[PDB]
Amino acid sequence: GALERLPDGPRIHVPRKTALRPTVARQVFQPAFAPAVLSKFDPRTDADVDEVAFSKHTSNQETLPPVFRMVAREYANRVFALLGRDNGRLSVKQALDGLEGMDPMDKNTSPGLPYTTLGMRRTDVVDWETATLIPFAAERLEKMNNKDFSDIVYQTFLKDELRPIEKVQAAKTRIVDVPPFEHCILGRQLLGKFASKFQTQPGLELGSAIGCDPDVHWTAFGVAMQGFERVYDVDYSNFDSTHSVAMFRLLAEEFFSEENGFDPLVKDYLESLAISKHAYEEKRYLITGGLPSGCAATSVLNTIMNNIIIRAGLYLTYKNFEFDDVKVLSYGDDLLVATNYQLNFDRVRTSLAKTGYKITPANKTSTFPLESTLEDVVFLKRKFKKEGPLYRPVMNREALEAMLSYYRPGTLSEKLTSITMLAVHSGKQEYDRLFAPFREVGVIVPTFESVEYRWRSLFW
Length: 460
Prior knowledge:
Layout lengths: L2 E3 L15 E2 L3 H4 L3 E3 L13 H6 L11 H18 L8 H6 L24 H4 E2 L4 E2 L1 H11 L7 E6 L3 E3 H5 L5 E4 L2 H19 L14 H12 L4 E6 L9 H11 L10 H9 E6 L2 E6 L9 H20 L8 E6 L2 E6 L5 H9 L28 E6 L2 E6 L1 H9 E2 L4 H12 L4 H12 L8 H10 L3
Parallel strand pairs: 6-10
Antiparallel strand pairs: 1-11, 2-16, 3-7, 4-5, 6-8, 9-13, 10-11, 12-13, 14-15
PDB class: viral protein
Keywords: RNA dependent RNA polymerase Cardiovirus Inhibitor resistance, viral protein
Assembly: monomeric
């Protein structure tokens, strides 16, 4: 129903071969993670990755009850009271360069279709100084400006990454959707002003942690949450399903509305995300519902949706629930609920499952605990460790060991450099244990003290 097979087109190349290679650490740590299945003939699975990858799109939740509209409206009122309603569209130059609260558009990333077929890059289709598109791209943009997204095709392929061993064996490989470059430019034009503002004020008050640096913001987040009796963690991750098409409609008319300062065309842009045409080799699918991965605004949209959904679930579960009975901190599929009340998220899970949404605990368990505090929760694979008046993001051990066990040739040193800044919060003994396999074989890795100094100095 939600996945319609269109007529075939030309073959867009899809990578069937991982770029990931094992490090010296793999044989020591032996993680229950490995490169995702990219090929029909992978011996590590019995399933067909092409069938399994798209199975989530075969069914989609048609409708949502009235409570979702009510929560979206109220969440919108709180956001735009904080962020203001100056959310008009940016110019193409402004979109390319970016505003104070956001980076410029990456010129090295894929231009999308049909440019990848013709062997072109983003720098070929636009001049970055003048902000001038080539005749073909200018016509495409003007077409979209007339509310017509008819010939926008997302370049779709399998995501080359580490997955849990269970997902490898079931061929549960994630999908990447790359939109055309002019679709990305339009998207940043329409939502970039809001986004830059949204990503620069992460915290409990906004309800979002998007755009945070965990090194600094863990203290702010932690300090705001420590006064609450309880903090629960919620995971939205679900390979088998995607966002309802109805959710896009709610955001279009309750959140990203003209009354909240957005351009008239946003409704149509959001529709091009909700119902999208995707190219996967020769095959062409029309997919109803779901968020494309490669859209710059994806993680922001997912964060907002999931914030709305958890309160909707609470209203659906508890007749006497009120908006301010909890505080929410959302980041993509990860969510914290801070409250003084005792809440039963097993019951909330049952309520949300009636609307096609799955929630699980953020940790290993299969059931939600009745009691949960700040010290118990996991958020972006990190716990909250108190350090005087500060909080530090202590990353899960299995996560660190998995990251250290594989790499991409060429970028090893900068991967290890990033991991030192994650591993520092686990203490010197653990830090040295994690990097021991590398410097036993002669690799120089920054000392614990050098990286600990850097973090400490952030608050002096």
